[PDB]
Amino acid sequence: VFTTVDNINLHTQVVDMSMTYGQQFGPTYLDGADVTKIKPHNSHEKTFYVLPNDDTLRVEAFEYYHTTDPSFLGRYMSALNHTKKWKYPQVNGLTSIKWADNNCYLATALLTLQQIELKFNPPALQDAYYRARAGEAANFCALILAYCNKTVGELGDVRETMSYLFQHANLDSCKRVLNVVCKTCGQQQTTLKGVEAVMYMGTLSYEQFKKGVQIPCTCGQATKYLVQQESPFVMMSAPPAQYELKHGTFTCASEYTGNYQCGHYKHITSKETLYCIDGALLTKSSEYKGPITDVFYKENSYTTTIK
Ligand SMILES: Cc1ccc(OCCN(C)C)cc1C(=O)N[C@H](C)c1cc(-c2cnn(C)c2)cc(-c2cnn(C(C)C)c2)c1
Ligand SMILES: [Cl-]
Ligand SMILES: [Cl-]
Ligand SMILES: [Cl-]
Ligand SMILES: [Cl-]
Ligand SMILES: [Zn+2]
Ligand SMILES: [Zn+2]
Ligand SMILES: [Zn+2]
Ligand SMILES: [Zn+2]
Ligand SMILES: [Zn+2]
């Protein structure tokens, strides 16, 4: 019998058939199911996931997941019991998810991550991220739910899910410098780094951010524009409104229709033409107009031209 916390460093233990796994190993999981109350069986003699009970397992658990929350393995194994049953079709060369248990926001996020450049700091996230691009995205979706502290069936927001994931990614080299102009106060330059340098809530178009956005001032309206952007991408979010998506001006977008929270997501991507991925469904179009809430753009190093 093998016990592990990372499926890498395995620990071989000797088991019997009298006591259950709970008494011998603590809460133990096979695949995604809970074999805590289940007694050992013949075909079980394989590797089992156990909650860390010593310092060696606690250290290995942090090295793989970068978390010390004792409930993390439980939330992760509970989500995996559903995600392993989902279907992950290949739509337009991308891995999507067939609709199941309100996974519309998870599918839009999964398709978005396969199109932007991202390096995850937790090794467990990075390893499953690679398998997700290759078609095996069950572990990756389950880990996303665990890190975001969300459960299967819960209604998720794509912008909130991306932000949670961005905080577990290497965005240290990302830098955004803004300039807020105000006729009374003057000019103030602010520098953002990391997660805050790649996301903005207000407008959907990256060009309006470069031209200037009407932002309030402490004295009372100013204008904020982008001076310099050094990031592999930018995420522009705005409340759901009708927007015009043109081929070649963006990478991918998030469509939200329906009421607040209990609504549905769809993924729009710009290839040789505009593609609409709704789980397992694909529709193409030369132009698009609909309710868009998130737009992702590509970037490397931008520097403004206004004094
Ligand atoms: C699907 C879903 C799941 C979870 C969730 O959790 C939010 C709670 N969270 C704070 C923890 C939200 C959503 C969700 O509805 N998302 C969508 C994208 C959404 C729709 C609407 C909206 C308004 N009218 N109608 C008919 C729809 C408004 C907005 C909106 C507005 N302003 N903001 C910014 C500033 C925070 C966002 C977001
Ligand atoms: Cl960490
Ligand atoms: Cl992390
Ligand atoms: Cl609202
Ligand atoms: Cl772009
Ligand atoms: Zn970490
Ligand atoms: Zn389910
Ligand atoms: Zn299920
Ligand atoms: Zn002012
Ligand atoms: Zn849905």
Swiss-Prot record:
The Ubiquitin-like domain covers which part of the protein? Answer: 1-50
Zinc fingers, C4-type class: 182-219
Q: How does it sit in the membrane?
A: Multi-pass membrane protein
Task: Report the outcome of residue 104 to A.
Answer: Unable to remove host IFIH1 (MDA5) ISGylation
Reading the lineage from the top rank, the first entry is Viruses
Q: Activity regulation per the record?
A: Inhibited in vitro by GRL-0617.
The catalysed reaction is:
Thiol-dependent hydrolysis of ester, thioester, amide, peptide and isopeptide bonds formed by the C-terminal Gly of ubiquitin (a 76-residue protein attached to proteins as an intracellular targeting signal)
**Residues involved in Zn(2+) 4 binding:** 182, 185, 217, 219
Impact after mutating residue 70 to S: In strain: Omicron/BA.2.75
User: Reported effect of changing residue 248 to S?
Assistant: In strain: Omicron/EG.5.1
Please report the stretch or stretches of sequence annotated as the Peptidase C16 domain. 64-307
User: Which residues are catalytic?
Assistant: 104 (for pl-pro activity), 264 (for pl-pro activity), 278 (for pl-pro activity)
Q: What does this protein do?
A: Responsible for the cleavages located at the N-terminus of the replicase polyprotein. Participates together with nsp4 in the assembly of virally-induced cytoplasmic double-membrane vesicles necessary for viral replication. Antagonizes innate immune induction of type I interferon by blocking the phosphorylation, dimerization and subsequent nuclear translocation of host IRF3. Also prevents host NF-kappa-B signaling. In addition, PL-PRO possesses a deubiquitinating/deISGylating activity and processes both 'Lys-48'- and 'Lys-63'-linked polyubiquitin chains from cellular substrates.
Tell me the subunit arrangement: May form homohexamers. Interacts with N protein.
Q: What is this protein called?
A: Papain-like protease nsp3
What is the organism field in this record?
Severe acute respiratory syndrome coronavirus 2 (2019-nCoV)
